């Protein structure tokens, strides 16, 4: 009926007047390409041979356009239509009629998409205004869309089979307004939380940390090699930090050529101890911490995501605020290129020597687990003798499970510290958790020491049978084994009655992500 | 137990406190078998094992094992009056006694997993959402699906050229027939950060293995047409349409049609080219002939002509195409490690070792720590032990007889470092690389999702009829 035809989602108003099928729009898969700027994207040549741009004919481009008419739809950089002042449209595709390829001022040639055009790129859902930014076109051979690595974090992309759209501006006012309003260098900082959206985060962040210690001494050859990759370079080679016995540079002295202008910044690094800044050695810092970038050159301090990532007051933020956007674009580019090209000299990996601890960390891990289990037996034995007084605000069940969860939650952070203080300097888990590119300090504890304790519906694993959890245990059992405390790790493997519980917890954590998106995506429409 | 009156599918539940007895003979229940325990010992003696490895010429099987009273079917309601012992060698001994009155016992506690979760090596080392990711991803790994794939005329079947069985195998892939019809190739993987084209879930892969058949395949799709008589003066016929007789005769190249109106098998067919020539007479004819899709360039495999249920002529054309892996295609491990291909380098550009074994596949280190897939690493160590010793390694879940220190003691004897690491050299400059890169053979799968089936563009094409906006799809 005519009500059902003018009704809601995919009707005539929510489906054909606001959102509609458009043309001049392409869609394929994204893959990385670290040799591109932030400002650019790489289009395959078949998409670029199908889409066009209607370009008028003036006496400043008549020769290049008659060249573009004389080759067309056989050679790629050509055209496919000539449009007259009458509005008449003659085609170059099939039967080109070669007596009528003459151009004149006022006509327009419909050109193919070349290098250097301005487009619009998009990933769905578009949750904010950083998710549709105007890139620039460079044309590359194979068959995916190719974009830079730092532009991943606005779009919330990843390169395991995503697809991203691009819409091509047709008129000249709309290409001018996309150029002067919504280019990707013009959108580095956000108005939402007045910090930048784009930071140096992946493999280049771990290698930015390992490029800026005091150990990194470069010889003359890779100073030549790495200085070949700077577009904002003077032409001068800086005089090294060490002149005898043989010339050696440092990482901070090559990194201080990337940092533009004369900007000033003071930050810290993630392993800056709290009781250092009080007493002596506050302006030396024997662990080489407390980054000071003074008059445009990194004097001291190990860099990490606290100084280059997405925070407020970072080095990319200060360089955006003081110098501009055309210089911050070059800053992101030069960091990623020179640190990748050093990173194939240094190299990086993760094995299982990076995931195992020595034979005296394991012993007191089992000593503190045996301590936790014995104390839980004391509490349960205390409650069965009718001797457990409740607390203000709680029942007897609530004070029981709150203090058992207190004991067990205080005895897996201890094993976590026994794992954290037993790593090494050459380790790679620790070299990822520190640098801030990926990982967290509970993953090191679950991989090495104790997985933890699962819980569905916000409490410890419930009696799904009558008075039991699984049919192996005895009725009304309340110990740590019977109700989900996974005391092994990911490397010592899991027992069956424990892998089942870990599957329950991971199931709940998968349901919540499966459900939440509809409610949030409904609120965000109703506000807007 | 010994089957006098009662068929073995009933369930007999006695709840003592409720003071009642429930007996169910109803259909639809689900159940699983178990081993009876007496006073404290089992009932399955060795007398039942030594005449059970002789099934081919003794006539002794599982039904003589049920009818002897040593296994028994238990369902879910009766699993609340039961007292299981999960393993006999550790839970029915004389120790500090947890329970002393067990009434059943499991066969092996790794029979709680399904079909797609019994193809994961070491599932007790992985984070359980990764097990849930791969339990829905070995359902779209291209392999060999059935042995008579020649006779069958299906739409959209993908067949791999050179499959291989895994080197690190669970002990329950002998029972669901994975070594007869496998899907995937044991590949030399390197977990290392090399150029930057394998960041955020991608893969560098060797081009000089792709040139030797690595993850190459073939793609068959079929086409049906069916002649019919719809009116008194309307009839459809397999005829080659000519220009001045039939009306709608566009840029498609009709000359490859034979006298029968059907393309013979062997000739290659590009885009927009007629494969079946059928026409209908006009109420002096108009054609209704089928095309292919856009930009395939395949070869017709076979053409099959028959008569249907009604009694009209009916044809089926199967068309094949070969698909070489390229830099958009999607590969996956057995541990939820999906990711496309990033770029392909030759063999003179991959990082070699001290005997010249470049990796087939380079994956990033960052995919390991945040999602905690360290079953991947143990099959990449166990794979390196198994390719050198000559066995095929065991990865069944709840062993407690395969440790990382035992695998490391075995790898220490064959001239390698006991934690998998090796010294790679650089391929662009020949210099060494300062860290030691974890190398080893793992089992990757090639998934269904390609980039030639997903690329798409548009500039001024067809529009809909009702609202005159561009089309859908």
């Amino acid at each position: 009926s005519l009500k059902q035809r003018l009704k809601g989602k995919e009707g005539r108003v929510r489906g054909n007047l606001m959102g509609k099928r458009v043309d001049f729009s392409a869609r394929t898969v994204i893959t990385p390409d670290p040799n591109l700027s932030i400002d650019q994207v790489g289009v395959p040549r078949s998409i670029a041979a199908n889409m066009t741009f209607a370009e008028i004919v003036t006496p400043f481009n008549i020769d290049r356009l008659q060249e573009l008419v004389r080759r067309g739809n056989s050679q790629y950089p050509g055209a496919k239509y000539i449009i007259r002042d009458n509005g008449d449209r003659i085609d170059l595709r099939f039967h080109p009629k070669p007596s009528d390829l003459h151009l004149q001022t006022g006509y327009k040639v419909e050109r193919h998409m070349c290098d250097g055009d301005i487009v619009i790129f998009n990933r769905q859902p578009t949750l904010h205004k950083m998710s549709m930014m105007g890139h620039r076109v460079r044309i590359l051979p194979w068959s995916t869309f190719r974009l830079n690595l730092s532009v991943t974090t606005p779009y919330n992309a990843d390169f395991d089979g995503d697809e991203m759209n691009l819409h091509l501006p047709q008129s000249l006012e709309t290409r001018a307004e996309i150029q002067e309003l919504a280019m990707v260098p013009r959108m580095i900082v956000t108005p939402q939380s007045n910090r930048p959206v784009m930071g140096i985060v992946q493999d280049t962040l771990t290698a930015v940390r390992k490029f800026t210690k005091r150990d990194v001494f470069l010889e003359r050859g890779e100073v030549m090699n790495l200085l070949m990759f700077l577009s904002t370079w003077d032409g001068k080679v800086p005089q090294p930090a060490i002149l005898k016995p043989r010339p050696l540079w440092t990482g901070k002295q090559i990194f201080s050529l990337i940092i533009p202008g004369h900007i000033n910044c003071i930050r810290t690094h993630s392993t800056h101890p709290d009781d250092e800044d009080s007493g002596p050695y506050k302006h030396i810092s024997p662990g080489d911490t407390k980054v000071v970038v003074e008059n445009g050159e990194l004097i001291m301090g190990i860099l990490c995501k606290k100084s280059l990532g997405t925070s407020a007051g970072s080095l990319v933020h200060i360089s955006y605020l003081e110098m501009g956007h055309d210089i911050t674009r070059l800053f992101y580019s030069n960091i990623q290129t020179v640190i990748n090209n050093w990173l194939l000299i240094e190299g990086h990996t993760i094995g299982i020597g990076d995931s195992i601890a020595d034979s005296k960390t394991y012993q007191d891990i089992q000593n503190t687990i045996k301590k936790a289990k014995q104390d839980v037996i004391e509490v349960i034995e205390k409650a069965h003798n009718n001797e457990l007084e409740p607390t203000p605000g709680n029942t007897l069940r609530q004070t029981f499970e709150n203090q058992v969860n207190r004991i067990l939650n205080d005895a897996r952070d201890k094993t976590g510290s026994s794992a954290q203080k037993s790593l090494s300097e050459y380790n790679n888990f620790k070299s990822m958790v520190v640098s801030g590119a990926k990982g967290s300090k509970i993953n090191i504890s679950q991989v090495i020491a104790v997985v933890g304790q699962q819980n569905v519906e916000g409490k410890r694993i419930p009696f799904g049978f009558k008075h039991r959890t699984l049919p192996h245990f005895i009725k009304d059992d309340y110990g740590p084994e019977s109700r989900g405390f996974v005391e092994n790790s990911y490397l010592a493997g899991l027992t069956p009655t424990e892998f089942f519980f870990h599957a329950m917890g991971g199931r709940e954590g998968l349901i919540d992500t499966a459900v939440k998106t509809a409610e949030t995506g409904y609120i965000q429409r109703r506000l807007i | 137990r010994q089957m006098d009156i009662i068929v073995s599918e009933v369930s007999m539940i006695r709840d003592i406190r409720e003071r009642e007895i429930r007996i169910y003979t109803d259909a639809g229940r689900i159940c699983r078998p178990l081993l009876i325990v007496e006073k404290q010992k089992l009932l399955l003696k060795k007398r039942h094992i030594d005449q059970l490895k002789e099934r081919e010429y003794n006539n002794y099987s599982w039904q003589d094992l049920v009818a002897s009273g040593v296994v028994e079917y238990i369902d879910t309601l009766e699993e609340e009056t039961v007292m299981l012992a999960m393993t006999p060698d550790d839970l029915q001994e004389k120790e500090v006694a947890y329970c002393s009155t067990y009434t059943h016992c499991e066969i092996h506690p790794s029979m709680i997993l399904g079909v797609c979760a019994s193809i994961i090596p070491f599932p007790d080392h992985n984070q359980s959402p990764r097990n849930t990711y791969q339990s829905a991803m070995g359902k779209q790994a291209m392999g060999v699906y059935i042995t008579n794939f020649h006779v069958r005329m299906d739409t959209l079947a993908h067949v791999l050229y050179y499959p291989q069985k895994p080197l690190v195998t669970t002990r329950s892939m002998e029972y669901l027939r994975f070594r007869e019809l496998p899907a995937g190739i044991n590949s030399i993987v390197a977990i290392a950060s090399y150029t930057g084209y394998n960041q955020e879930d991608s893969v560098i892969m060797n081009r000089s293995a792709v040139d030797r058949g690595f993850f190459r395949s073939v793609f068959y799709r079929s086409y049906k047409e069916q002649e019919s008589k719809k009116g008194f003066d309307q009839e459809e016929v397999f005829e080659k349409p000519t220009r001045e007789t039939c009306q709608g005769m566009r840029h498609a190249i009709y000359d490859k049609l034979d006298d029968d109106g059907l393309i013979a098998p062997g000739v290659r067919v590009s885009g927009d080219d007629v494969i079946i020539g059928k026409t209908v007479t006009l109420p002096t004819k108009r054609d209704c002939s089928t095309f292919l899709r856009t930009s395939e360039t395949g070869i017709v495999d076979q053409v099959m002509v028959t008569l249907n249920q009604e009694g009209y002529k009916f044809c089926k054309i199967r068309v094949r195409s070969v698909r070489i892996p390229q830099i958009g295609d999607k590969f996956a491990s057995r541990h939820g490690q999906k990711g496309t291909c990033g770029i392909q380098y030759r063999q003179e550009d991959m990082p070699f070792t001290c005997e010249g074994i470049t990796p087939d596949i380079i994956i990033n280190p960052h995919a390991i720590p945040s999602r905690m897939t360290i079953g991947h690493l143990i099959e990449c160590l166990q794979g390196k032990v198994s390719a050198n010793k000559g066995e095929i390694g065991d990865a069944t879940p709840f062993n407690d007889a395969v440790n990382v220190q035992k695998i490391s003691n075995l790898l220490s004897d064959y001239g390698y470092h006991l934690r998998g690491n090796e010294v790679l050299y650089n391929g662009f400059t020949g210099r060494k690389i300062t860290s030691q890169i974890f190398i080893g053979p793992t089992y990757y799968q090639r998934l269904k999702h390609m980039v030639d089936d997903k690329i798409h563009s548009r500039a001024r094409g067809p529009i809909q009829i009702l609202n005159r906006q561009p089309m859908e799809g």
Partner: peptide, 8 residues
């Protein structure tokens, strides 16, 4: 999968 205060 960690604890009551963490994640499941």
């Amino acid at each position: 999968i960690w604890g009551i205060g963490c994640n499941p």
